[PDB]
Scaffold this active site. Structure first.
Site, PDB file in Angstrom:
ATOM      1  N   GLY A 113       0.968  -1.193   0.041  1.00  0.00           N
ATOM      2  CA  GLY A 113       0.081  -0.042  -0.013  1.00  0.00           C
ATOM      3  C   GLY A 113       0.890   1.209   0.079  1.00  0.00           C
ATOM      4  CB  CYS A 149       3.048  -9.084  -0.878  1.00  0.00           C
ATOM      5  SG  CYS A 149       2.549 -10.015  -2.649  1.00  0.00           S
ATOM      6  CB  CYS A 154       1.546 -12.688  -2.655  1.00  0.00           C
ATOM      7  SG  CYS A 154       1.050 -11.394  -1.840  1.00  0.00           S
ATOM      8  CE  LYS A 157       0.585 -17.433  -2.421  1.00  0.00           C
ATOM      9  NZ  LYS A 157      -0.556 -17.115  -1.407  1.00  0.00           N
ATOM     10  CB  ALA A 289      -6.457 -24.659  10.221  1.00  0.00           C
ATOM     11  CE1 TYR A 291      -2.927 -16.368   2.361  1.00  0.00           C
ATOM     12  CE2 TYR A 291      -4.714 -15.415   3.744  1.00  0.00           C
ATOM     13  CZ  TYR A 291      -3.334 -15.306   3.229  1.00  0.00           C
ATOM     14  OH  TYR A 291      -2.839 -13.886   3.174  1.00  0.00           O
ATOM     15  CG  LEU A 294      -4.799 -25.242   5.009  1.00  0.00           C
ATOM     16  CD1 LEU A 294      -6.294 -25.407   4.650  1.00  0.00           C
ATOM     17  CD2 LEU A 294      -4.571 -26.415   5.545  1.00  0.00           C
ATOM     18  CD  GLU A 295      -1.659 -19.872   0.208  1.00  0.00           C
ATOM     19  OE1 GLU A 295      -0.866 -19.408   0.327  1.00  0.00           O
ATOM     20  OE2 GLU A 295      -2.827 -19.592  -0.689  1.00  0.00           O
ATOM     21  NE  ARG A 312      -6.349 -22.817  18.992  1.00  0.00           N
ATOM     22  CZ  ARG A 312      -5.870 -22.653  20.254  1.00  0.00           C
ATOM     23  NH1 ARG A 312      -6.823 -22.919  21.189  1.00  0.00           N
ATOM     24  NH2 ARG A 312      -4.610 -22.547  20.343  1.00  0.00           N
ATOM     25  CG  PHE A 319     -11.871 -18.947   3.108  1.00  0.00           C
ATOM     26  CD1 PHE A 319     -11.226 -18.612   3.992  1.00  0.00           C
ATOM     27  CD2 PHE A 319     -11.765 -18.401   1.721  1.00  0.00           C
ATOM     28  CE1 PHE A 319     -10.088 -17.968   3.783  1.00  0.00           C
ATOM     29  CE2 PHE A 319     -10.644 -17.711   1.468  1.00  0.00           C
ATOM     30  CZ  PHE A 319      -9.755 -17.266   2.522  1.00  0.00           C
ATOM     31  CG  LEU A 435      -6.951  -9.984  -0.197  1.00  0.00           C
ATOM     32  CD1 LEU A 435      -8.163  -9.916  -1.109  1.00  0.00           C
ATOM     33  CD2 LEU A 435      -6.440 -11.332  -0.305  1.00  0.00           C
ATOM     34  CG  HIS A 565     -14.630 -27.607 -26.043  1.00  0.00           C
ATOM     35  ND1 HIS A 565     -14.820 -28.550 -25.053  1.00  0.00           N
ATOM     36  CD2 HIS A 565     -14.530 -28.584 -26.995  1.00  0.00           C
ATOM     37  CE1 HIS A 565     -14.891 -29.776 -25.233  1.00  0.00           C
ATOM     38  NE2 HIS A 565     -14.414 -29.837 -26.874  1.00  0.00           N
ATOM     39  CD  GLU A 570     -15.738 -25.861 -22.203  1.00  0.00           C
ATOM     40  OE1 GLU A 570     -16.790 -25.800 -23.132  1.00  0.00           O
ATOM     41  OE2 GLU A 570     -14.900 -26.702 -22.540  1.00  0.00           O
TER      42      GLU A 570
HETATM   43  C1  LIG Z   1      -8.399 -29.634 -35.861  1.00  0.00           C
HETATM   44  C2  LIG Z   1      -9.716 -28.925 -35.626  1.00  0.00           C
HETATM   45  C3  LIG Z   1      -9.369 -28.420 -34.169  1.00  0.00           C
HETATM   46  C4  LIG Z   1     -10.487 -27.716 -33.612  1.00  0.00           C
HETATM   47  N1  LIG Z   1     -10.394 -27.145 -32.357  1.00  0.00           N
HETATM   48  C5  LIG Z   1     -11.346 -26.482 -31.883  1.00  0.00           C
HETATM   49  C6  LIG Z   1     -11.419 -26.122 -30.604  1.00  0.00           C
HETATM   50  O1  LIG Z   1     -10.231 -25.978 -29.922  1.00  0.00           O
HETATM   51  N2  LIG Z   1     -12.453 -25.583 -30.098  1.00  0.00           N
HETATM   52  C7  LIG Z   1     -13.926 -25.250 -30.827  1.00  0.00           C
HETATM   53  O2  LIG Z   1     -14.685 -24.948 -30.064  1.00  0.00           O
HETATM   54  N3  LIG Z   1     -13.732 -26.083 -31.971  1.00  0.00           N
HETATM   55  C8  LIG Z   1     -12.771 -26.526 -32.628  1.00  0.00           C
HETATM   56  N4  LIG Z   1     -12.945 -27.090 -33.718  1.00  0.00           N
HETATM   57  C9  LIG Z   1     -14.116 -26.766 -34.203  1.00  0.00           C
HETATM   58  C10 LIG Z   1     -15.150 -27.833 -34.031  1.00  0.00           C
HETATM   59  O3  LIG Z   1     -14.801 -29.200 -34.199  1.00  0.00           O
HETATM   60  C11 LIG Z   1     -16.280 -27.906 -34.980  1.00  0.00           C
HETATM   61  O4  LIG Z   1     -16.940 -26.503 -34.897  1.00  0.00           O
HETATM   62  C12 LIG Z   1     -17.510 -28.737 -34.358  1.00  0.00           C
HETATM   63  O5  LIG Z   1     -17.056 -30.237 -34.600  1.00  0.00           O
HETATM   64  C13 LIG Z   1     -18.790 -28.688 -35.686  1.00  0.00           C
HETATM   65  O6  LIG Z   1     -19.846 -29.697 -35.049  1.00  0.00           O
HETATM   66  P1  LIG Z   1     -20.911 -30.123 -35.950  1.00  0.00           P
HETATM   67  O7  LIG Z   1     -22.048 -30.879 -35.275  1.00  0.00           O
HETATM   68  O8  LIG Z   1     -21.297 -28.785 -37.023  1.00  0.00           O
HETATM   69  O9  LIG Z   1     -20.243 -31.252 -37.050  1.00  0.00           O
HETATM   70  P2  LIG Z   1     -19.273 -32.464 -36.902  1.00  0.00           P
HETATM   71  O10 LIG Z   1     -18.695 -32.284 -35.261  1.00  0.00           O
HETATM   72  O11 LIG Z   1     -18.439 -32.455 -37.782  1.00  0.00           O
HETATM   73  O12 LIG Z   1     -20.259 -33.750 -36.767  1.00  0.00           O
HETATM   74  C14 LIG Z   1     -20.901 -34.038 -38.013  1.00  0.00           C
HETATM   75  C15 LIG Z   1     -20.905 -35.464 -38.228  1.00  0.00           C
HETATM   76  O13 LIG Z   1     -21.944 -35.838 -39.339  1.00  0.00           O
HETATM   77  C16 LIG Z   1     -21.279 -36.962 -39.954  1.00  0.00           C
HETATM   78  N5  LIG Z   1     -22.044 -37.122 -41.176  1.00  0.00           N
HETATM   79  C17 LIG Z   1     -21.993 -36.312 -42.384  1.00  0.00           C
HETATM   80  N6  LIG Z   1     -22.666 -36.480 -43.442  1.00  0.00           N
HETATM   81  C18 LIG Z   1     -23.452 -37.524 -43.050  1.00  0.00           C
HETATM   82  C19 LIG Z   1     -24.544 -38.192 -43.814  1.00  0.00           C
HETATM   83  N7  LIG Z   1     -24.792 -38.047 -44.797  1.00  0.00           N
HETATM   84  N8  LIG Z   1     -25.106 -39.039 -42.719  1.00  0.00           N
HETATM   85  C20 LIG Z   1     -24.840 -39.370 -41.444  1.00  0.00           C
HETATM   86  N9  LIG Z   1     -23.699 -38.884 -41.107  1.00  0.00           N
HETATM   87  C21 LIG Z   1     -23.041 -37.935 -41.707  1.00  0.00           C
HETATM   88  C22 LIG Z   1     -19.918 -36.647 -40.120  1.00  0.00           C
HETATM   89  O14 LIG Z   1     -19.064 -37.750 -40.442  1.00  0.00           O
HETATM   90  C23 LIG Z   1     -19.658 -36.069 -38.632  1.00  0.00           C
HETATM   91  O15 LIG Z   1     -19.314 -37.312 -37.962  1.00  0.00           O
HETATM   92  C24 LIG Z   1     -11.758 -27.831 -34.269  1.00  0.00           C
HETATM   93  C25 LIG Z   1     -11.982 -28.058 -35.533  1.00  0.00           C
HETATM   94  C26 LIG Z   1     -10.854 -28.745 -36.195  1.00  0.00           C
HETATM   95  C27 LIG Z   1     -10.972 -29.355 -37.580  1.00  0.00           C
HETATM   96  C1  LIG Z   2       2.426 -16.031   3.769  1.00  0.00           C
HETATM   97  C2  LIG Z   2       1.632 -14.889   3.221  1.00  0.00           C
HETATM   98  C3  LIG Z   2       1.075 -15.104   1.950  1.00  0.00           C
HETATM   99  C4  LIG Z   2       0.331 -14.187   1.357  1.00  0.00           C
HETATM  100  N1  LIG Z   2      -0.349 -14.427  -0.085  1.00  0.00           N
HETATM  101  C5  LIG Z   2      -0.960 -13.501  -0.413  1.00  0.00           C
HETATM  102  C6  LIG Z   2      -1.424 -13.702  -1.746  1.00  0.00           C
HETATM  103  O1  LIG Z   2      -1.069 -14.818  -2.578  1.00  0.00           O
HETATM  104  N2  LIG Z   2      -2.400 -12.697  -2.406  1.00  0.00           N
HETATM  105  C7  LIG Z   2      -2.591 -11.384  -1.790  1.00  0.00           C
HETATM  106  O2  LIG Z   2      -3.449 -10.583  -2.232  1.00  0.00           O
HETATM  107  N3  LIG Z   2      -2.175 -11.199  -0.408  1.00  0.00           N
HETATM  108  C8  LIG Z   2      -1.295 -12.291   0.274  1.00  0.00           C
HETATM  109  N4  LIG Z   2      -0.961 -12.005   1.340  1.00  0.00           N
HETATM  110  C9  LIG Z   2      -1.160 -10.699   2.105  1.00  0.00           C
HETATM  111  C10 LIG Z   2      -0.518  -9.635   1.756  1.00  0.00           C
HETATM  112  O3  LIG Z   2       0.975 -10.077   2.150  1.00  0.00           O
HETATM  113  C11 LIG Z   2      -0.783  -8.272   2.336  1.00  0.00           C
HETATM  114  O4  LIG Z   2      -2.222  -8.243   2.537  1.00  0.00           O
HETATM  115  C12 LIG Z   2       0.008  -7.057   1.927  1.00  0.00           C
HETATM  116  O5  LIG Z   2       1.402  -7.073   2.076  1.00  0.00           O
HETATM  117  C13 LIG Z   2      -0.321  -5.966   2.893  1.00  0.00           C
HETATM  118  O6  LIG Z   2       0.153  -4.672   2.498  1.00  0.00           O
HETATM  119  P1  LIG Z   2       0.519  -3.565   3.557  1.00  0.00           P
HETATM  120  O7  LIG Z   2       1.240  -2.219   2.638  1.00  0.00           O
HETATM  121  O8  LIG Z   2      -0.699  -3.184   4.302  1.00  0.00           O
HETATM  122  O9  LIG Z   2       1.652  -4.053   4.471  1.00  0.00           O
HETATM  123  P2  LIG Z   2       3.079  -4.757   4.374  1.00  0.00           P
HETATM  124  O10 LIG Z   2       3.171  -5.205   2.874  1.00  0.00           O
HETATM  125  O11 LIG Z   2       3.122  -5.753   5.373  1.00  0.00           O
HETATM  126  O12 LIG Z   2       3.982  -3.417   4.603  1.00  0.00           O
HETATM  127  C14 LIG Z   2       4.206  -2.853   5.865  1.00  0.00           C
HETATM  128  C15 LIG Z   2       5.619  -2.467   5.738  1.00  0.00           C
HETATM  129  O13 LIG Z   2       5.766  -1.313   6.787  1.00  0.00           O
HETATM  130  C16 LIG Z   2       7.074  -1.883   7.611  1.00  0.00           C
HETATM  131  N5  LIG Z   2       6.900  -1.131   8.980  1.00  0.00           N
HETATM  132  C17 LIG Z   2       6.239  -1.537  10.019  1.00  0.00           C
HETATM  133  N6  LIG Z   2       6.339  -0.687  10.977  1.00  0.00           N
HETATM  134  C18 LIG Z   2       7.177   0.266  10.756  1.00  0.00           C
HETATM  135  C19 LIG Z   2       7.744   1.510  11.123  1.00  0.00           C
HETATM  136  N7  LIG Z   2       7.306   2.005  12.471  1.00  0.00           N
HETATM  137  N8  LIG Z   2       8.542   2.202  10.565  1.00  0.00           N
HETATM  138  C20 LIG Z   2       8.677   1.936   9.021  1.00  0.00           C
HETATM  139  N9  LIG Z   2       8.231   0.986   8.592  1.00  0.00           N
HETATM  140  C21 LIG Z   2       7.517   0.187   9.345  1.00  0.00           C
HETATM  141  C22 LIG Z   2       6.998  -3.203   7.541  1.00  0.00           C
HETATM  142  O14 LIG Z   2       8.222  -3.905   8.100  1.00  0.00           O
HETATM  143  C23 LIG Z   2       6.823  -3.383   6.122  1.00  0.00           C
HETATM  144  O15 LIG Z   2       7.730  -3.383   5.231  1.00  0.00           O
HETATM  145  C24 LIG Z   2      -0.144 -12.907   2.046  1.00  0.00           C
HETATM  146  C25 LIG Z   2       0.570 -12.636   3.320  1.00  0.00           C
HETATM  147  C26 LIG Z   2       1.117 -13.762   3.841  1.00  0.00           C
HETATM  148  C27 LIG Z   2       1.843 -13.582   5.287  1.00  0.00           C
END
Ligand SMILES: Cc1cc2nc3c(=O)[nH]c(=O)nc-3n(C[C@H](O)[C@H](O)[C@H](O)COP(=O)(O)OP(=O)(O)OC[C@H]3O[C@@H](n4cnc5c(N)ncnc54)[C@H](O)[C@@H]3O)c2cc1C
Ligand SMILES: Cc1cc2nc3c(=O)[nH]c(=O)nc-3n(C[C@H](O)[C@H](O)[C@H](O)COP(=O)(O)OP(=O)(O)OC[C@H]3O[C@@H](n4cnc5c(N)ncnc54)[C@H](O)[C@@H]3O)c2cc1C
Ligand SMILES: COc1ccc2sc(N)nc2c1
Ligand SMILES: COc1ccc2sc(N)nc2c1
Ligand SMILES: COc1ccc2sc(N)nc2c1
Lengths: 587, 587
Positions: A113, A149, A154, A157, A289, A291, A294-295, A312, A319, A435, A565, A570
């Site tokens: 902060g 942090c 953070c 960790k 116990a 976060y 446990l982390e 305890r 949570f 945080l 997908h 999703e």
């Molecule tokens: C390499 C690749 C990667 C892809 N990756 C992604 C991805 O990561 N994410 C995503 O969202 N989309 C992805 N897609 C697109 C996704 O696969 C298509 O949008 C989706 O499969 C279309 O669904 P459909 O029901 O229109 O047809 P299809 O899933 O092609 O099904 C049509 C079916 O009808 C059958 N058929 C055809 N003619 C006849 C018939 N006369 N009689 C009976 N059966 C017949 C075919 O053989 C086939 O089995 C990818 C496509 C490809 C080619």
């Molecule tokens: C193990 C652990 C993991 C965490 N993981 C996460 C996480 O993943 N995500 C998340 O969002 N938060 C996480 N947090 C919380 C996060 O660290 C704190 O919410 C955040 O650091 C608070 O910021 P701050 O500025 O209030 O204090 P701090 O970051 O603690 O800063 C205060 C500073 O002032 C100094 N100070 C104190 N008294 C004096 C003084 N009199 N004169 C001068 N300086 C002084 C301190 O020594 C320190 O340097 C975690 C905390 C811990 C302990």
């Protein structure tokens, strides 16, 4: 209305120019200011819907109604002719540095902060000091600029979490066709720590460079507020002195608690010590116990350690407890032992071997809630039993800053304390989520209101979280039990499903451990009150939905959005099984 | 209004009960139907806005204004007494089974859309048949039920992408302290293909079980629509016959194209063949620049192959071209070679060694856009130059179904063709995004409108995507160039930033390669028009933001939402550098 805003803005801005985007006289003044390297806020009246009213109100301060108008620390300095006069007569620099106090802003605490607040304020011309000091742990551990942090939170960790995740990547690689043999591979703790600490060191340096480049004074000294405008500092030679500032931001954070039992301070450690420990902890007991508990237990187990957690009462108090239990069951199936309903009553059997780089050995004695006895040996004992501020170290009681029963600072919704020029941000602001992104947002937004006339407040509601256990848990909004308590069981509907990551199929991982649910309010158009997900990359999954919840998403908004997908996320777009129906959520 | 909805629902539903949740006479009818194992839709009038208006409108069909009322295929069957009369006299089963057609619904095509439509329809008592047949590739490749995504698309492609990602996990693990040496580790293509194919086979079988358990007739037969209600089928013995159906859903998808050049069909392969190929492709040429081309070239390079992509003009035509260039630059730096502005003019040097499981060898000759010549040898040549339907096989031109100039079906916004009882879904529906979750939503929503009186339409706008290149690219909404073209440059603001995953720090990966931006409309409250992110887990990052964009998110909504730390996704919550400002986006 407008008039009260303008008066607050003129009084606390350090250097501010009232302007219009289309005015060559304003451009002329702008050009002079940074040629002289004078930073300042600017408000373009032709961009505000009531700049006409604002322009009239200025006359109450300057006796004139035109632009540009330049102010310094609440005093009208002049129009275009007058600023230029001061420039060519070499009077300008002294005008803008005139002040009742040493600094426009003193920040006590150099963490998430405080660094954010200090850097933002300096952008608008506030002369700024950031104080940071790190009180060593009981065994002597200390670290650099950046806060909890960056150094002991953070950042290290999650880096050690990633090291643990890589153990399963090595396992999975065999099933995807890679030739390695996971059973012949081991982990080197000290190699990991060296890499983690080198990254932290680059962050310490980066922050000191950033403060230099923004003209912020960095003092590695302990600060103490002794009156509303006076900060007493003690440096590393124990020299004591006093500096003064107009606005004060308190940002000192918290440190870990120890239980009041024999041997805890002497022979145990906390998270403060773990992230730079020079030896593998070995066989480890984690007491607590939260976060944090446990982390830490989770990544230690993935890195090959023999790990027990002593609970305890419950896991993850505050949570959603169905999610808490699934988190723990997964950990218990992948190595972690739990001593449930148990507290400690620590004996030293071996001193830490500082020469050969080895832990010591300890006897832990305790008892279960039914009275039966606990007794077992461990090489390392880590306490994770909460965190607390110690503001009686930062804040003299005579200043008048009100604290609550836990010792945190009671603030208005603009971070103001009971002393009108003093503010508090971050973990010590009572009742706010503890945080890093919250502390950063609060600090930056407060700086803009003090020194640039901004009005936006920080919104602390429905802030999303992620617990980085070996299987991660993301959430945004209410737990299911909180929702039912607030609205009654008959107004709450819960949609849910198990799922299997596609990455887990070829790897032969578990079919029905990942889980997600939406907790909704029937009488408010099935509004999403809370979102919960257990699975890989849960933080990446949850973040985007936090924007939709902020805007008031309903179940219907989730249904009409189409999925990507193949992803885990999703599954949130096609949820249909309700808890009330009793239908199984397995897939 | 209400009149014409009710008419449409009664004429189209197979079995539908009009009921009230509070009525014990309805409860008795439901129980009779459940015991006789008669599936049906149910409309609970006491939970609809104008259920009172419907209740008097039912009199137009039944001459009664009371509840319950049961209908079968557009005919009123009776009230509680009458239905129990038919049940007591063993007349009910014949009443609910009598129809003018063999089936209430015939689905041609057993893929993403078709299977989803068929299972959803059968849930409301529609008597349903699903036809699927896989015509073999030119070298004879064939596969089981489930469609393109399940067998030769999203599923096997993302599983091989994961195998490629694990090569970087192996490299990274050394830096996090694990004792392996990436240098002495190899990949086995056939072990991978075996595991991927075993998962696909569990999906083929799962779909056959699902159809059986929903009382859906599955025919592994080629279907051809010869009149509005008649489907001619050809089975595995060439036995030809005719079945009839009330509603028809065309869902036959597309197959890969080949370029019209010597040797292409004889000696090249497509993605249809790649995912079950019995031998490692070896030195590979990928011809094309679609997302299919780049995804395949990317994982082949990560698995240790020597890979070249031949690009006719640009990468990822239709996607944001700044983003496409960053994707291609990352692949070029991590081992993929590109032959830019180049097309092919294929010669066989060695025949595929089907015995010892080895590729052949080919000579590719081509020319560049200025006139220079391309000539080089490859072991495998993969064509990814687009996909097309062939509805002339599926659909007789005399039936009257309008096709567009590309051969896709022209549909209304409720998937209806120009023949009133015939609908089209998925990749053959002209103008719609060609994605698996789109086809599933279209199919499930259509079945509910036909057979359960639902009214909700599929929303095809702002559907998010992810390209699973070695560094992944997620998007939702307009590209930057399309936004500028539609609204003008002065009305478009772009916020952008590089970032570095925390996981990449200890692993010594690149500082300024991951990238993200928001494209916004100034005159509409800074509405987010498009979102783009290049980085790890891009599909998990993007999905949740698609809900917010569906709801009309603005930049201020992204700003007031708080980040989850440490994640990649949180960089979206604090964007501030604009493109107009000229300030660098590096970190
Ligand atoms: C390499 C690749 C990667 C892809 N990756 C992604 C991805 O990561 N994410 C995503 O969202 N989309 C992805 N897609 C697109 C996704 O696969 C298509 O949008 C989706 O499969 C279309 O669904 P459909 O029901 O229109 O047809 P299809 O899933 O092609 O099904 C049509 C079916 O009808 C059958 N058929 C055809 N003619 C006849 C018939 N006369 N009689 C009976 N059966 C017949 C075919 O053989 C086939 O089995 C990818 C496509 C490809 C080619
Ligand atoms: C193990 C652990 C993991 C965490 N993981 C996460 C996480 O993943 N995500 C998340 O969002 N938060 C996480 N947090 C919380 C996060 O660290 C704190 O919410 C955040 O650091 C608070 O910021 P701050 O500025 O209030 O204090 P701090 O970051 O603690 O800063 C205060 C500073 O002032 C100094 N100070 C104190 N008294 C004096 C003084 N009199 N004169 C001068 N300086 C002084 C301190 O020594 C320190 O340097 C975690 C905390 C811990 C302990
Ligand atoms: C358990 O499987 C995993 C875990 C972590 C990682 S980091 C990466 N690139 N791939 C994986 C796969
Ligand atoms: C930088 O080291 C320091 C700084 C300030 C103080 S106040 C104190 N008691 N010890 C120290 C040590
Ligand atoms: C193996 O199943 C089939 C099903 C239908 C047909 S029509 C045809 N020409 N060949 C087949 C094969």
């Amino acid at each position: 209305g407008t008039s009260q805003w303008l008066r607050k803005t003129v009084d606390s801005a350090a250097v501010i120019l009232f302007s219009k985007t289309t005015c060559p006289y304003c451009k002329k003044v702008k050009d002079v200011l940074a040629e002289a390297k004078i930073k300042h806020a600017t408000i373009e009246l032709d961009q505000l819907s009531n700049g006409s009213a604002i322009q009239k109100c200025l006359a109450s301060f300057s006796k004139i109604e035109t632009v540009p108008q330049m102010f310094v620390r609440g005093k009208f300095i002049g129009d275009s002719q007058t600023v230029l006069k001061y420039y060519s007569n070499d009077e300008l620099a002294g005008i803008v540095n005139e002040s009742k106090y040493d600094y426009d802003l003193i920040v006590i605490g150099g963490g998430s902060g405080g660094l954010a607040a200090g850097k933002e304020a300096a952008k608008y011309g506030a002369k700024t000091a950031v104080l940071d000091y790190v009180e060593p742990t009981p065994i002597g551990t200390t670290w650099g600029l950046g806060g909890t942090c960056v150094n002991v939170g953070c950042i290290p960790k999650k880096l050690m979490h990633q090291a643990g995740l890589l153990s399963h990547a090595l396992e999975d690689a065999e099933h995807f066709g890679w030739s390695l043999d996971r059973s012949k591979i081991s982990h080197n703790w000290s190699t990991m720590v060296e890499g983690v600490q080198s990254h932290i060191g680059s962050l310490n340096w980066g922050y000191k460079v950033a403060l230099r480049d923004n003209q912020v004074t960095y003092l590695n000294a302990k600060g103490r507020l002794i009156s509303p405008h006076e900060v007493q500092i003690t440096d590393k030679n124990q020299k004591v002195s006093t500096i003064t500032g107009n606005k004060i931001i308190l940002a000192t954070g918290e440190r870990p608690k120890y239980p009041e039992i024999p041997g805890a301070v002497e022979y145990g450690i906390t998270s403060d010590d773990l992230f730079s420990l020079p030896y593998f902890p070995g066989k480890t007991l984690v007491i607590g116990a939260s976060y944090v508990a446990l982390e830490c237990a989770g990544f230690l187990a993935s890195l090959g350690g023999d790990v027990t957690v002593m609970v305890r009462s419950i896991l993850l108090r505050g949570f959603d407890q169905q999610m808490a239990e699934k988190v723990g069951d997964y950990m218990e199936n992948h190595g972690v032992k739990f001593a449930k309903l148990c507290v400690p009553d620590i004996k030293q059997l071996k001193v830490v071997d500082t020469e050969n780089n080895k832990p010591g050995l300890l006897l832990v004695k305790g008892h279960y809630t039914d009275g039966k006895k606990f007794e077992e040996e461990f090489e390392t004992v880590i306490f994770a039993v909460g965190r607390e501020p110690q503001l009686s170290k930062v804040l003299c009681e005579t200043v008048g800053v009100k604290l609550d029963k836990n010792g945190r600072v009671v603030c208005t919704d603009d971070e103001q304390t009971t002393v009108s020029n003093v503010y508090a941000i971050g973990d010590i602001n009572a009742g706010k989520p503890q945080l890093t992104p919250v502390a950063i947002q609060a600090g930056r937004y407060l700086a803009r209101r003090l020194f640039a006339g901004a009005t936006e407040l920080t919104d602390y509601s429905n802030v999303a979280t992620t617990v980085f256990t070996p299987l991660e848990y993301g959430a945004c909004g209410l737990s299911e039990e909180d929702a039912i308590e607030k609205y009654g069981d008959k107004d709450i509907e819960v949609y849910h499903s198990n799922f299997k990551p596609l990455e887990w199929t070829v790897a032969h991982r578990e079919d029905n451990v990942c889980y997600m649910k939406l907790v909704c309010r029937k009488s408010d158009n099935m509004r999403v009150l809370g979102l919960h997900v257990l699975g890989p990359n849960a933080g990446e999954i949850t973040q985007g939905y936090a924007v939709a919840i902020k805007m008031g998403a309903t179940k219907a908004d989730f249904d009409r959005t189409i999925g990507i997908h193949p992803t885990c996320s999703e599954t949130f777009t096609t949820l249909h099984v309700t808890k009330k129906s009793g239908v199984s959520p397995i897939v």
